[PDB]
């Protein structure tokens, strides 16, 4: 019989839940009611970037705080110079249904993917100076939701077939495959050491993986809807999740428990993208109500809103040096807020 | 500022290429194909392919009718769940929905999928072209008897053929009665929400009717005309 295994599973689970509860004695709200509040912070659209024909579905910041890449469902991948709003590259895509974009941490490669189930890697630097498709990765039985360049030769992707995988560009293999999710893995983020990454799926849960090891380390619950996006605290010990239930949450790795939840009654639309600031004090979250809100990472107060978009905000990313934040929305516009 | 001048020239070249691509992108209409496994949408896409990868995931069928260049996307190897990726097709000319009228057992399931597609938040303004495919099998089933569609839907006998019906010559009253019953079953959900933002265009495609492209062209022409009239506040 296997019913005994089924009941002991939840038994060995509830024991985990009560151990987590025992390890929890105080909330962040009580501890944080000492510091001076951040207060109202106003951000203005320093630069707007136009040229995309259709909605913008993803973006990434280059590792130089200057170059920007953005993918839109018109089939065009555009690389901007955020300082001068000059279109450096206008790479056209094979399939127009692109759902994710990435920038290599070297400035030489640019990745993309989407409903075509293929992660395409473009070589920015070439002998003739023309952008070419360096490699195409296949093996995902579902739409590609997110991809992050772990290295110049290694890339980790998360697709809608409840799996995440680690790929090698020079062979297009699947040396490591991360399974365990029970829904479409919507987003993932790498820790700032290229050692562990987290991935939020549609099963209202997040998991911590290990690129070197290959299996999930811990998993986090607490959400009641699909996790639309995920981020990572700069220290590497915490990460913030945004879900369709209009509530953001903070989790800690070593604590292995839910820390505190960001929410408000006025807002009702779900999250689309989250991103921490350089100091880890500001948490910027996108929304379907056409504006993104920045909340203090500790006291959970609406410091301000970046209300400047005419349609749903889909992508949002804080620069590597923290000098600026850029949001791309479905109105085919990118804005640089400071 | 020579490097700045070179960068500006490169940006100008890229912008001109972007305008050239924008003209073509705005000059074509994008359609999304939806339906169950036993809906015949594969046969429809195959016939309109000639009328004009392993994993795949998405497909394409560029057919041209009177120089309009419709793009027709059929979803391939994707998981059963479709709540998330359907947001990509929130700005398309129309959504083509194909239903197997003969299959009574899964008819209700097709009804719920059509209802969910109609009531989706991100497809509120997207019109739907309805293709009640496999009409010949539906025709032969009722004459052959031993079907009893009334058990699945306890409303057939309390129903009469609408006066709007225009049956083809030399066809039985029972077959057109059943056809219009199914069409009105879909139209009941069609005319229950959306006000005047998106509509449903039902058609009776038999198996291989070559006029499917013409029907799609006419429906898209109606949709664009309605949109333009709405922009001018006339409609």
């Amino acid at each position, epitope marked *: 019989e296997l019913d005994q295994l089924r009941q002991e599973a939840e038994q060995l689970k509830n024991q985990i839940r009560d151990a987590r509860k025992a390890c929890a004695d105080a909330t962040l709200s009580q501890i944080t009611n000492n510091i001076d509040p951040v207060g109202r912070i106003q951000m203005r659209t320093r630069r707007t970037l136009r040229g995309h024909l259709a909605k913008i579905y993803a973006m990434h910041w280059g590792t130089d705080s200057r170059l920007l890449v953005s993918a839109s469902q018109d089939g065009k991948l555009i690389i901007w110079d955020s300082y001068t709003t000059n279109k450096v590259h206008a790479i056209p895509l094979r399939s127009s249904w692109v759902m994710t974009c990435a920038y290599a941490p070297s400035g030489n490669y640019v990745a993309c993917g989407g409903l075509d189930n293929i992660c395409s890697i473009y070589n920015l630097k070439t002998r003739e100076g023309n952008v070419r498709v360096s490699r195409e990765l296949a093996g995902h039985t579902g739409y590609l939701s997110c991809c992050r360049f772990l290295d110049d030769n290694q890339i980790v992707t998360s697709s809608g077939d*409840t799996t995440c995988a680690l790929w090698d560009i020079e062979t297009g293999q699947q040396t490591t495959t991360f399974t365990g999710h*029970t*829904g479409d893995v919507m987003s993932l983020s790498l820790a700032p050491d290229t050692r562990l990454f987290v991935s939020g799926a*549609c*099963d*209202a*849960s997040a998991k911590l993986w290990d690129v070197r090891e290959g299996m999930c380390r811990q998993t986090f*619950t*607490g959400h*009641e*809807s*699909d996790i639309n996006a995920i981020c990572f605290f700069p220290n590497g010990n915490a990460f913030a999740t945004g879900s*369709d*239930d209009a509530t953001c949450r903070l989790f800690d790795l070593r604590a292995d428990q839910e820390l505190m939840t960001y929410s408000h009654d006025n807002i*009702i639309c*779900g999250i689309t993208s989250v991103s921490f600031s350089k100091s880890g004090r500001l948490l910027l979250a996108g929304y379907d109500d056409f504006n993104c809100n920045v909340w203090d990472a500790l006291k959970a107060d609406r410091a301000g809103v970046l209300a400047g978009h005419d349609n749903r905000v889909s992508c949002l990313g804080v620069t590597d040096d923290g000098m600026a934040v850029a949001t791309g929305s479905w109105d085919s516009f990118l804005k640089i807020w400071n | 500022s020579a490097e700045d001048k070179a960068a500006v020239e490169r940006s100008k070249m890229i912008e001109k290429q972007l305008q050239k691509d924008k003209q073509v992108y705005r000059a074509t209409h994008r359609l999304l194909l939806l339906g169950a496994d036993n809906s015949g949408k594969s046969t429809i896409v195959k016939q309109m392919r000639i009328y004009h990868v392993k994993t795949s995931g998405i497909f394409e069928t560029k057919f041209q009718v009177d120089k309009v260049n419709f793009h027709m996307f059929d979803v391939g190897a994707q*998981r*059963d*769940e*479709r*709540r998330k990726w*359907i947001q990509c097709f929130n700005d398309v000319t129309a959504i083509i929905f194909v239903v197997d009228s003969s299959d009574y057992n899964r008819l*209700q*399931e097709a009804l*719920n999928d059509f*209802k*969910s597609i109609w*009531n*989706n*938040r991100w497809l509120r303004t997207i019109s739907v072209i309805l293709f009640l495919n496999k009409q010949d099998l539906l025709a032969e089933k009722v004459l052959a008897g031993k079907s009893k569609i009334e058990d*699945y*839907f*306890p*409303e057939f006998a309390r129903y009469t053929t609408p006066e709007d019906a225009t049956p083809e010559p030399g066809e039985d009253p029972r077959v057109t009665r059943a056809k219009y019953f199914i069409r009105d079953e879909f139209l009941r959900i069609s005319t229950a929400s959306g006000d005047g933002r998106h509509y449903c265009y039902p058609h009776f495609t038999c198996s291989v009717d070559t006029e499917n492209a013409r029907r799609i062209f006419n429906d898209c022409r109606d949709i664009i005309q309605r949109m333009h009239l709405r922009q001018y506040e006339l409609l």
Partner: nanobody, 124 residues
């Protein structure tokens, strides 16, 4: 955590009555749309009924139209399904699925083979 449990079911003579109680925890039960999905043996999952978040918009399948009734208890975060006049073809496993998006009418993928927000189910 999203947890759904079902109570009731069993084996009864044809034409009898059965009561199904669904217990939901881990989310605000008063801000969601709950659906009933049944799967007959040797057959795929079939949608049965849906209840709106306000308890007004209620629909059923034509197979059990006018015979199956539903009840929702937002205060207790529980759902009660009452059935009468059991038919020989009504034997199936019933799951009290939940629509994914809160504060909305539509909900996709309720009848999925591997839907995340679905309970284990009770055989009837």
């Amino acid at each position: 955590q999203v947890q759904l449990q079902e109570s009731g079911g069993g084996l009864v003579q044809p034409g009898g009555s059965l009561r199904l109680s669904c217990a939901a925890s881990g989310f605000t039960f008063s801000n969601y749309k709950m659906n009933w999905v049944r799967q007959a043996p040797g057959k795929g999952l079939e949608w049965v009924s849906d209840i709106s978040q306000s308890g007004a918009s209620i629909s059923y399948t034509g197979s059990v139209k006018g015979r199956f009734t539903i009840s929702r208890d937002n205060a207790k975060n529980t759902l009660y399904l009452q059935m009468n006049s059991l038919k020989p073809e009504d034997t199936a496993v019933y799951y009290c699925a939940r629509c994914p998006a809160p504060f909305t009418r539509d909900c996709f993928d309720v009848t999925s083979t591997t839907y995340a927000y679905r309970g284990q189910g009770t055989q009837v």
